[PDB]
């Protein structure tokens, strides 16, 4: 029986699985009114990807395809007809919520669209177009292979093979950034399907543990932080995918250890469906040294009583 | 002895180690007049990182730090005083060519700077600043902790903590994109230090094998492709770092296999210093199916004669 293991990576060596930026801290908080059902960064401990999860951070919130002129519309001057990583048209009949890597938060995603290369004399960054991809637009239908592009800088050309590089999120007067409200992958008034399940603590006194990053915000949230919290960093997802070690129990007891002091700082429950719970009450950014990392201890059932963190 | 292994990943499941985009193809070519001495994606087979190589794709050609006003006189309206992943000031005395993740190509890197969040009414993408980072500028001195920022869109504010997200490259009338000319990390008229060694084929009939991507080009190279070629994908670098398996000979013989036909398509020599050679003459994008991957076969010496590819 292949042993289950975790990669040995400090917090600064981990990538957010919901946006291509490094993890900054571990963070716990109650679920109060949030449905915790993110679709990127979903993977069982025995290596089964779930939701819209794939292996490349460079594909998370990244899009590519052909631009289609959309005249008669205030917001999206063009659409993007999405293609697979190598030009193949996306099949909406796959049993997934949306193309793998699709943004799994509600609101505005900001990035740069690039298109056919232009001559040097055309101008500086003339093939770079700042665009908003808003999930509240009626044109946000990634499940059927089309999203709406709202150009901000540098008019976008139709009928050109284009790539979208994500930079951050945005919040304008009527579109709040809501990381735990899934977007309508199939368009307005349509409900989401084939979703990775929502997660929540089920043992008394426990809370979810998140890998937390601050995403750049190009509009709004003055004096505030745009947080993106994932259940698993990308490197854990990829490690479980590679190893495919069979799960021997409901929970993998993991201990957070400091390697040069040799002491365990706290412990947590890594559930077989791919998320972590800790014994704590309240919103709390975890105070841990920069060289610490989780270590797989043993297989326990879901009724294991953690030491309070 | 811990066995040496490669990760089981297809071409579309690999990331360029020199720019945060996926690998598109394998590509071999003679060195003719290029010095092949890239500094990102450099790692020995037993897990020794070299050059400017670190583990995160989100750190390659990404920068962060404090903006500094620069009036007088050239290209760069502001400088970026570089800081570590968590705000620590960069130490120029470290035995490395430049901060880890620093671009290792000559020319113009394009991306978006983000700064202190602004209110919603400030405007769309107002906290998004399109900038050129040119290595031919006298302000390109990342080895001493500072680079020059040429603003294209959205004036950059001084004295703000800022993050630069890379998007692509650019080529203007006098700054060609040269992926095999290392930039002057320490400024104009200064030579580079602490470099990972240059690589070249040393056996008759052999050429380097590259992992190739097309990087977005926001100015110039009309009708052309801005290729970035790396010696190792990021996933191999991180795998070797995790495993740290001892190298038993000068060369790891590796075979490219198709897993659903069972056939071996070609073989190659993976040298212990972390680069691949193949038996081929001429520039050639390798014609291989999308499901193929490299498999470690055996340890051989540097004089192993490969089957012609
Ligand atoms: C900031 C604001 O309130 N803008 C209003 C527009 O709202 C945008 O609508 C598009 C869809 O067309 C997206 O949903 C985007 O996220 C929204 O911010 C609205 O379309 C127009 C209607 O006249 O009014 C603007 O004020
Ligand atoms: C396109 C062009 O010819 N530009 C010239 C400027 O060259 C730039 O110089 C900066 C450093 O100052 C960078 O090296 C950049 O990559 C260059 O393109 C040059 O500075 C000015 C002199 O006035 O002339 C421009 O024509």
Domain ranges across chain B = 1-59+171-309, 60-170
Helix (H, G, I), strand (E, B) or coil at B291: coil
Listing DSSP states for B241-283 in one string gives HHH-PPP-SSEEEEEEE-TTT--EEEEEEEETTTEEEEE--S-
Please provide the size of chain B in residues.
309
Nearest to A139 by CA among A78, A212, A226, A223: A78
Q: Cα separation of B294 and B265, whole Å? A: 10
What is the Rg, in whole angstroms, of the alpha carbon atoms belonging to chain B? 20
Residue of A11, A13, A56 to mutate, testing the B interface (most B Cβ within 10 Å of its Cβ): A56
Interface touch B220/A153, C-beta < 8 Å: no
Q: Cα separation of A59 and A20, whole Å? A: 8
Interface touch A20/B20, C-beta < 8 Å: yes
Q: Specify the experimental method.
A: X-ray
Biggest CA–CA distance in chain B, Å, is: 67
Nearest to A30 by CA among A233, A182, A200, A181: A200
Q: Are strands B25-29 and B108-114 parallel, antiparallel or unpaired?
A: unpaired
Residue B138's CB is within 10 A of a number of other CB atoms, namely 14
Nearest to A99 by CA among A134, A61, A128, A151: A61
Residue B76 near residue B148 (C-beta atoms within 8 A): yes
Helix (H, G, I), strand (E, B) or coil at A5: coil
User: Is the CB of A117 inside 8 Å of chain B's CB atoms?
Assistant: yes
Q: Which residues, 6 or more positions from A273, have their beta carbon under 8 angstroms from its beta carbon?
A: A44, A45, A197, A199
Handedness of CA B54, B58, B61, B67 (dihedral sign): negative
Residue owning the nearest CA to atom 22 of ligand 2: B74
Q: What are the backbone angles phi and psi of residue A45, rounded to the nearest 5°?
A: -65, -25
Q: Cα separation of A276 and A27, whole Å? A: 11
- How would you classify residue B221: left for phi > 0, otherwise alpha for psi between -120 and 50, otherwise beta? left
Burial class (CB in 10 A: 0-12, 13-18, 19+), A244: middle
Residue A201's CB is within 10 A of a number of other CB atoms, namely 21
Question: In angstroms, what separates the C-alpha of B53 from chain A's closest C-alpha?
Answer: 13
Q: What angle do CA B119, B124, B127 make, to 5 degrees?
A: 60
Residue A251 near residue A269 (C-beta atoms within 8 A): yes
Beta bridge partners of A257: A264, A293
Nearest to B234 by CA among B274, B178, B201: B274
Residue A278's CB is within 10 A of a number of other CB atoms, namely 23
Beta bridge partners of A209: A28, A276
Resolution of the model in angstroms:
1.6
Q: Which residues, 6 or more positions from A35, have their beta carbon under 8 angstroms from its beta carbon?
A: A180, A181, A182, A198
CA distances from residue B99 to A240, B62, B144 in whole angstroms, order as listed: 31, 11, 9
Q: Are strands B63-69 and B129-134 parallel, antiparallel or unpaired?
A: unpaired
Ligand closest to Cα of A136 equals 1
Q: What angle do CA B169, A148, A122 make, to 5 degrees?
A: 35
Q: Which residues, 6 or more positions from A186, have their beta carbon under 8 angstroms from its beta carbon?
A: A141, A143, A144, A192, A193
User: Is the CB of A12 inside 8 Å of chain B's CB atoms?
Assistant: yes
Measure CA A219 to chain center: 20
Residue A161's CB is within 10 A of a number of other CB atoms, namely 13
| CATH number listed for the domain at residues B60-170 | 2.40.30.120
Q: Cα separation of B83 and B142, whole Å? A: 10
Task: Output the six-digit token pair for A284.
Answer: 């709390």
Nearest to B293 by CA among B233, B230, B227: B233
Closest chain A residue to the Cα of B224, Cα to Cα: A117
The DSSP output letter for A241 is H
Q: Cα separation of B36 and B51, whole Å? A: 13
Interface touch A20/B21, C-beta < 8 Å: no
Burial class (CB in 10 A: 0-12, 13-18, 19+), A300: middle
What are the counts of helices (DSSP H) followed by strands (DSSP E) for chain B? Answer: 1, 14
User: Is the CB of B277 inside 8 Å of chain A's CB atoms?
Assistant: no
Nearest to B22 among A56, A119, A223 (CB): A56
Measure CA A187 to chain center: 20
Q: Cα separation of A234 and A257, whole Å? A: 21
Residue B78 near residue B67 (C-beta atoms within 8 A): yes
Q: Are strands B78-82 and B129-134 parallel, antiparallel or unpaired?
A: unpaired
Residue B194 near residue B95 (C-beta atoms within 8 A): yes
Residues of A in contact with B20 (CB under 8 A): 20, 57-58
User: Is the CB of A121 inside 8 Å of chain B's CB atoms?
Assistant: yes
User: Is the CB of A288 inside 8 Å of chain B's CB atoms?
Assistant: no
A1-59+171-309: CATH class: mainly beta
Ligand 2 residue neighbourhood (C-beta within 6 Å): B 74-75, 108, 134, 136-137, 172-175
Residue B251 near residue B304 (C-beta atoms within 8 A): yes
Torsion of CA B110, B114, B115, B118, to 10 degrees: 130
Q: Cα separation of B19 and B130, whole Å? A: 18
Nearest to A28 by CA among A297, A279, A293: A279
Q: Cα separation of A201 and B68, whole Å? A: 46
Q: Cα separation of A252 and A45, whole Å? A: 9
- How would you classify residue B223: left for phi > 0, otherwise alpha for psi between -120 and 50, otherwise beta? left
Residue A87's CB is within 10 A of a number of other CB atoms, namely 10
Task: Output the six-digit token pair for A297.
Answer: 């201890």
Listing DSSP states for B35-97 in one string gives -B---SS-B-TTS-B-TT--S-GGGTT-EEEEEEE--SSSS-SEEEEEB-TTSPBP-TTSSSS
The DSSP output letter for A61 is T
Listing DSSP states for B215-245 in one string gives EPBSSS-TTS-EEEEESS-HHHHHHHHHH-P
Handedness of CA A36, A39, A42, A47 (dihedral sign): positive
Q: Cα separation of B89 and A301, whole Å? A: 45
Ligand 1 residue neighbourhood (C-beta within 6 Å): A 74-75, 134, 136-137, 172-175
Same fold, A1-59+171-309 and A60-170: no
Nearest to B22 by CA among A24, A203, A101, A103: A101
State the DSSP H helix or E strand holding residue A257, giving kind and residue range, or none if neither: strand A251-257
Helix (H, G, I), strand (E, B) or coil at A12: helix
Interface of A with B in 61-100 (CB under 8 A): 85-86
Q: Cα separation of A124 and B205, whole Å? A: 43
Residue of B64, B111, B218, B224 to mutate, testing the A interface (most A Cβ within 10 Å of its Cβ): B218
- How would you classify residue A53: left for phi > 0, otherwise alpha for psi between -120 and 50, otherwise beta? beta
Residue B140's CB is within 10 A of a number of other CB atoms, namely 25
State the DSSP H helix or E strand holding residue B25, giving kind and residue range, or none if neither: strand B25-29
Q: Which residues of A140-158 are buried (b: 16+ CB within 10 A; e: fewer)?
A: bbbbebbbbbbbbbbebbe
Q: What are the backbone angles phi and psi of residue B241, rounded to the nearest 5°?
A: -65, -40
Q: What angle do CA A40, A129, A100 make, to 5 degrees?
A: 20
Beta bridge partners of B110: B132, B168
Task: Output the six-digit token pair for B301.
Answer: 């010496």
Question: In angstroms, what separates the C-alpha of A205 from chain B's closest C-alpha?
Answer: 32
Residue B219 near residue B76 (C-beta atoms within 8 A): no
Q: What are the backbone angles phi and psi of residue B80, rounded to the nearest 5°?
A: -115, 115
Interface touch A55/B13, C-beta < 8 Å: yes
């Amino acid at each position: 029986t292949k042993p289950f293991t975790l990669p040995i990576l400090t917090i600064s060596e981990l990538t957010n699985s919901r946006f291509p930026i490094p993890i900054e801290q571990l963070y716990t908080a109650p679920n109060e009114n949030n449905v915790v059902q993110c679709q990127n960064g979903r993977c069982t401990l025995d290596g089964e990807l779930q939701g819209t999860t794939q292996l490349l951070s460079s594909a998370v919130c990244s899009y590519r395809g052909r631009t289609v002129a959309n005249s008669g519309d205030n917001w999206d001057q063009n659409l993007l007809q999405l293609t697979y990583p190598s030009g193949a048209s996306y099949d909406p009949t796959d049993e997934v919520p949306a193309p793998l890597g699709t943004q799994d938060f509600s609101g505005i995603l900001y990035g740069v669209l690039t298109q056919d290369n232009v001559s040097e004399g055309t101008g500086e960054a003339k093939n770079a177009k700042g665009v908003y991809i808003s999930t509240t637009s009626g044109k946000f239908t990634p499940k059927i292979g089309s999203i709406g592009l709202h150009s901000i800088t540098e008019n976008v050309h139709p009928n050109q093979q284009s790539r979208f590089t994500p930079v951050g999120v945005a919040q304008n007067e009527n579109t709040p950034f809501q990381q735990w409200v899934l977007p309508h992958y199939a368009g307005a008034l349509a409900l989401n399907t084939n979703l990775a399940p929502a997660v929540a603590p089920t043992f008394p006194g426990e809370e979810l543990l998140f890998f937390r990053s601050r995403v750049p915000c190009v509009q709004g949230l003055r004096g505030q932080d745009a947080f993106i919290d994932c259940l698993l960093p990308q490197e854990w997802v990829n490690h479980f995918y590679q190893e495919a070690a069979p799960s021997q129990a409901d929970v993998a007891l993991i201990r957070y250890v400091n390697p040069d002091t040799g002491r365990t700082l706290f412990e947590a429950k890594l559930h077989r469906s791919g998320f972590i719970t800790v014994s704590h009450t309240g919103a709390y950014p975890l105070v841990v040294p920069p060289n610490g990392h989780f270590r797989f201890d043993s297989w326990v059932n879901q009724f294991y009583s953690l030491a309070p963190m």
